[PDB]
Design a protein around this nucleic acid. Structure first.
Lengths: 305, 99, 333, 333
DNA sequence: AGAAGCTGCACCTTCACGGC
C-alpha cells in the first residue's frame, strides 16, 4: 500500500565526512538505514507541513573516495583517523577508529500525500532541497553547492501526471540525470537461492553471504568463478537481543518517552546496478519493515523482481 | 585431588611469570608475592575479583571504550523472513566473549 | 535537579575541506581557472638524527647505525615555479538553533537549559561570539603553517543566498592580528550575518577563499593524515598528506579548530592568545589542558552551576559555555 | 623540568626545488627565458667493472668478465652544444622564531627551553649563524658536482619584497672559499638581512640564481632520485635523475643540506672544513659520524645540559645547538 | 573528629609469504 504518486529527485549531493564504517563486518558505503533515516527526518521536518509522506529512497553514488591507506607491506587497508584533544591533565587520549569517506550521491524519494494537486509544481521540491541542505546524511555534512560554473536543480515527477508515452518519456528524462551513478538494490531472494544451491547436505552459519562477497579463483577439472554484478554485503536491519523495555526502565537512554531495545545487526546482500536496467523506476526504493514484537527492524527494496 | 596439581601448576606458573619480570635486587617483594600468589588465598582473592559477564553477542566496549554501560549474553531469535541471516547462529558453534 | 544523563550538541559552524590552488598574485580576479597543487611522493635520504636507546644494545651497532644513512619516502606539496600565491578555498555552513540540545534525557533539564540559553540570547545575543568567529575567518588562521611566512594574505568571503552571491567581503588578514579582537564596520556586518544564521532564522552558506603570498616554488602544507603506526611496516613512510579530488586540502576539523580558537578567558595568563574552545580547555601544542576542574572554570562545572544551581557565571565565561554549545559534544552522567 | 616526550621543530630556512636552465655566458643579465635542461634517458654498453662474487668465481662463468657488454640504462643531463653556462634558480624563505616548538608535552620544559633560547638570542643574536648561512649562500655549495670543474661561478641574490627586488647582491662564488668564513661588506649586509629574518623582525624571501661555466655541451648533474625498491634486475635503470615538468632540477633537501654546512666545531680533527649540522653530526658519504655519543658533544647531551641541568656549553656548541633548532626535527624521550 | 571526592599505583598483556 506504500506506493508513491511522485518521485522527488534530489540531485548529486556531495558528502564530506560520511561513515565509511557501515557495520561490524562490512565497511565502505554507508548503510541504507542512514538514507531511510534521512528521508524520515526530512518527513519529520518538512513533510508534515505539506501533508505529504516521504517513504522510499534510491541511491546512485556518482563517486566514492574513502579515507584509507595501505600499510606498506600488507594486503589489507587501514583507516585514516582523526585527532582528538587531550583528556583532562594533558595526555594523548585513547583513539577510537572512525571511518570517514567522501560520497557524491543523488537520491530519488517517493512522495505519497495529498499535498499536491497542481499547486506545488516545483516549489515543493525547492522547499525539500533548501531544507535538506542544512542536514547530514550518514554523519557527513552535505556540502550545499557553492558558487561555481553551474547550478544543480531538483525535480518532481508524477506517475499520474502524464500518459503512457509521457510516462516512459519522463522515466527516460529522469534516468538521464543519474546515469553515471549505480543503483543500490537489496537482493535477498538471490542470497536464499545461492544458499539453497550451496546447502547440499552441509549447513551454514554466515558463509552464504561471505562466499558471494569474496573472489574465489578455485579449480574445477586456474579458473575463477563469476558473480552477477557487484554483490556486496550490506547491513539490512537489526534483530532483537532483549525484550523491549518501558521508557522509564533503561538508564541512560536518548529520551525517556520511547521504548528501548537491545539489538544486533542483520546482514544481507546488495547489488550496484546501473539505473538504465531497472525496468520500473517506481521500484528501487528503500522501505522499513518493523514487525516490532518479534524484532526484525529491517529495511529493504521490495517489489523488485 | 586429581585436579589439584593442575591448578597448583597454574598458580606456580603465574607466580614464576610474576617473579621473572620483576627486575628485582632489593626491597624483598618476593615474600609477599609468595605469600599471596602461591597459597590458596589466591582463590579467595580470585573469587573476590569480579567483573566478568561471559557475553555472546553484546560488547559495549568497542563503542568508545570509556563507557560503563550494559553488556548482554542473549543470542537472538532466528529470523522468520527468508533471505538474510546473521549472528553465526544456525551452526558451527561459537566461543563466548567475556568483558 | 539532576542533570541530563545523555546531553548531545551538534556542530554548528560546520566548515568544508579547504582545497588548495596555485596562481600568481594580482591574478586573484580570475581565480577559478587556477590549477590545484597535487601531493607528490618523494624519497629522501637523511641521517639517524633521533636519539638512541642504549638499553639491551651494543655500542658498535649503534655508532655504525649513526654512521650509516637513513632512507625514507615522504609526501610533499609544492607550489609551481610560476605561482607565488596559494589559494585556499572552502565553504562554511552556519546552521542555526544554537542552544538546542540534540539529545537530552530529562524534560526538566531540557526546559531549564532552553530557558538559560534563551535568557542569554535575550540579554546578550551572538554579538561577541560572532565577532570572534568573524575575526577568525577574517584573519587567515585556517592557514596553520601557510601563514607564518606569508608577505601578504587576503580573505575574500561571499554569502551565497539562493544560488548566487549576495554579499562580498574583502579583508587584509595581516592587519587583523591573531591575538586581538578589534571592532570594525565590515567585521560587524559579517558578525551580524553570522548571528542571523546562528539565531535559528537561517542556515547561512559562505565561501571563504584566502590568498597567501608564500613564494615561487615554495612548499605548502595540507593537513597530515593520522595513521597509528602499530603493525607491519605501516610507518616506513612517516608522512602522508590529505588529498580530495586529486588536490591537497586541509581537514574539516582543522578548519573548525582554526576558526574556533576564540577563547581569551582562561585562568592562566590570557594575554598569551586565544585557544580553542574545548571542555577542560586543551591545547595540543603546549601539551597542557587549561581550566582543570580543580579550579571552577571548566565547561562542565560552569554548565551545571548555570542551569542547575541557578548561579550565573561571569559575563566572559558564559560566552565560553555557549561557545562549547556551538562547538558541540557528548556530555552527561 | 625533564625533557618532553614529544618535541617537534619546524624548518626555518626553507628552500625550493632548484630548477636548471642552460645558456651562454655574458648573456647572464637577460637570462630569463633560457631553455631548460631536460633529462635524457640513454642506454650504455659497458663492461663488468664490479668485483666478482663467489658464484661467478667458477672457471666457466668468468666469461662474464670476458664477453659481456653489461647493457645498462642511465639518465643524463647535458647542456646544448652552443651553451656553456648552467643556471640554477631557487627561492628561500627564512622565517624566524627558532626556539619555539610546534609540538610539546611538558609546558615547564617548553618555558625552560624558551628561556634558554631567549637568553641566547639576547646574549648573542643570530650573527655567526646568519653569517655562515650567507657565506654558504655566497659560494655555490648548492652546486654540488656542478662546481668541481666550473671555470667561473657567479651568484645573484635578490631580496624579493613584493614582486620586485629590494636589494641585489652579486658574488663571485669561486673567490669565496668553501672552508673559511671571511668578511665582506655585501656579505655582512646579506648576513644582517638573514639575521633580521631569523629573529622574526621581517619577512625575508630571497631569489638565488647561480651561473657556472661548465663547458660547451658538457654534462651537468642534477639530483638523482632515490628509488626505494629492492632486488630486481634486467629492467631496472639504477640511475633516475630528478626533474620537474621536463626541466632538470636539484632536490630542495639537497640545497638545504648544502647551505647548512656551518659546523666547524667538532671534537675530531677540524682542519678539513665545515660539515652539516645534524645531531650526532654525520657525513654518511664519508662514512664517519662526528660528535659521537662517546664524546659529550652531540646535540642531545649538550641540549639536555643546557636546558635541564642549566650547564651552559661553550659559545660554539651554543651555535651548534641553535643551528640544530633552526634545522628542525624530532627531539624527545 | 567523622564523610565525600580526588589522585596514585597496581594489575592485565606479541606474527605464518607473490593484482579480473
Amino acid at each position: 500500500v506504500t506506493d508513491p504518486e511522485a518521485l522527488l529527485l534530489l540531485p548529486r549531493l556531495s558528502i564530506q565526512n560520511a561513515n565509511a564504517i557501515s557495520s561490524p563486518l562490512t565497511w565502505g558505503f554507508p548503510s541504507p538505514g542512514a538514507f531511510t533515516g534521512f528521508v524520515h527526518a526530512l518527513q519529520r521536518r518538512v513533510g508534515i507541513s505539506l501533508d505529504i509522506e516521504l517513504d522510499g529512497v534510491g541511491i546512485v553514488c556518482h563517486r566514492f573516495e574513502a579515507q584509507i591507506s595501505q600499510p606498506a607491506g600488507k594486503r589489507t587497508k587501514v583507516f585514516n583517523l582523526t585527532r582528538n584533544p587531550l583528556n583532562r591533565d594533558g595526555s594523548t587520549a585513547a583513539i577510537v577508529e572512525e571511518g570517514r569517506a567522501h560520497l557524491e550521491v543523488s537520491l530519488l524519494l517517493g512522495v505519497h500525500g495529498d499535498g499536491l494537486d497542481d499547486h506545488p509544481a516545483q516549489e515543493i521540491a525547492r522547499q525539500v532541497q533548501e531544507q535538506a541542505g542544512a542536514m547530514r546524511l550518514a554523519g557527513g555534512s552535505i556540502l550545499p553547492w557553492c558558487n561555481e560554473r553551474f547550478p544543480a536543480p531538483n525535480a518532481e515527477l508524477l506517475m499520474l501526471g502524464g500518459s503512457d508515452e509521457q510516462r516512459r518519456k519522463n522515466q527516460r528524462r529522469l534516468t538521464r540525470r543519474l546515469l553515471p551513478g549505480f543503483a543500490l538494490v537489496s537482493r535477498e531472494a538471490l542470497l536464499q537461492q545461492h544458499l539453497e544451491t550451496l546447502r547440499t547436505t552441509l549447513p551454514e552459519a554466515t558463509t552464504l553471504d561471505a562466499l558471494l562477497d569474496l573472489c574465489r579463483i578455485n579449480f574445477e577439472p586456474w579458473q575463477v568463478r563469476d558473480k552477477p554484478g557487484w554483490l556486496v554485503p550490506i547491513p539490512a536491519g537489526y534483530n532483537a537481543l532483549s525484550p523491549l523495555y518501558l521508557p522509564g526502565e533503561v538508564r541512560n537512554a536518548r529520551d525517556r518517552e520511547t521504548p528501548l531495545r537491545f539489538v544486533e545487526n542483520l546482514f544481507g546482500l546488495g547489488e550496484w546496478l546501473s539505473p538504465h536496467r531497472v525496468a520500473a523506476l517506481s521500484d528501487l526504493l528503500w522501505y522499513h519493515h518493523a514487525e516490532p514484537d518479534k524484532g526484525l527492524y529491517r529495511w529493504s527494496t521490495p517489489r523488485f523482481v | 585431588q586429581e585436579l589439584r596439581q593442575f591448578i597448583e601448576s597454574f598458580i606456580q606458573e603465574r607466580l614464576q611469570g610474576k617473579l621473572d619480570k620483576l627486575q628485582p635486587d632489593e626491597d624483598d617483594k618476593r615474600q609477599t608475592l609468595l605469600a599471596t600468589h602461591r597459597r590458596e588465598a589466591w582463590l579467595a582473592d580470585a573469587a573476590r575479583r569480579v567483573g566478568q559477564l561471559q557475553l555472546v553477542t553484546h560488547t559495549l566496549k568497542p563503542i568508545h571504550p570509556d563507557a560503563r554501560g550494559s553488556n548482554l549474553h542473549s543470542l537472538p531469535q532466528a529470523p522468520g523472513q527468508p533471505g538474510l541471516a546473521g549472528s553465526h547462529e544456525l551452526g558451527d558453534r561459537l566461543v563466548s566473549d567475556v568483558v | 535537579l539532576s542533570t541530563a544523563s545523555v546531553l548531545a550538541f551538534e556542530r554548528k559552524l560546520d566548515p568544508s575541506d579547504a582545497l588548495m590552488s596555485a596562481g600568481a598574485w594580482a591574478q586573484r580576479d580570475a581565480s577559478q581557472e587556477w590549477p590545484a597543487v597535487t601531493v607528490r611522493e618523494k624519497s629522501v635520504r637523511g641521517t639517524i638524527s633521533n636519539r638512541l636507546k642504549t638499553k639491551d644494545r651494543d655500542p658498535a651497532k649503534l655508532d655504525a647505525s649513526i654512521q650509516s644513512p637513513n632512507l625514507q619516502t615522504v609526501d610533499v606539496a609544492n607550489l609551481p615555479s610560476d605561482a607565488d600565491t596559494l589559494k585556499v578555498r572552502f565553504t562554511l555552513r552556519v546552521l542555526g538553533g544554537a542552544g538546542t540540545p540534540s539529545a537530552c534525557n530529562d524534560a526538566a533539564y531540557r526546559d531549564k537549559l532552553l530557558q538559560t540559553v534563551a535568557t542569554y540570547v535575550n540579554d546578550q545575543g551572538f554579538a561577541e561570539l560572532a565577532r570572534r568567529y568573524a575575526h577568525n575567518l577574517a584573519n587567515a588562521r585556517f592557514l596553520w603553517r601557510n601563514r607564518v611566512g606569508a608577505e601578504a594574505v587576503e580573505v575574500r568571503i561571499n554569502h551565497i543566498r539562493q544560488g548566487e552571491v549576495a554579499r562580498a567581503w574583502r579583508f587584509d588578514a595581516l592587519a587583523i592580528g591573531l591575538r586581538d579582537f578589534k571592532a570594525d564596520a565590515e567585521l560587524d556586518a559579517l558578525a551580524e550575518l553570522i548571528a542571523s544564521g546562528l539565531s535559528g532564522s537561517g542556515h547561512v552558506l559562505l565561501e571563504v577563499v584566502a590568498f597567501a603570498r608564500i613564494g615561487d616554488g615554495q612548499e605548502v602544507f595540507p593537513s597530515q593524515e593520522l595513521i597509528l603506526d602499530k603493525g607491519d611496516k605501516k610507518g616506513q613512510k612517516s608522512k602522508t598528506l590529505y588529498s580530495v579530488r586529486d588536490a591537497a586540502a586541509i581537514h574539516s576539523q582543522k578548519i573548525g579548530n582554526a576558526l574556533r580558537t576564540i577563547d581569551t578567558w582562561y585562568p592562566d595568563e590570557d594575554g598569551l592568545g586565544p585557544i580553542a574552545v574545548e571542555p577542560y580547555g586543551s591545547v595540543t601544542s603546549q601539551g597542557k589542558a587549561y581550566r582543570q576542574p580543580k579550579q571552577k572554570l571548566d565547561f562542565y562545572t560552569l554548565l551545571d552551576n548555570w542551569v542547575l544551581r541557578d548561579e550565573a557565571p561571569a559575563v566572559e565565561q558564559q560566552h565560553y559555555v555557549i561557545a562549547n554549545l556551538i562547538r558541540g559534544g557528548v556530555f552527561g552522567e
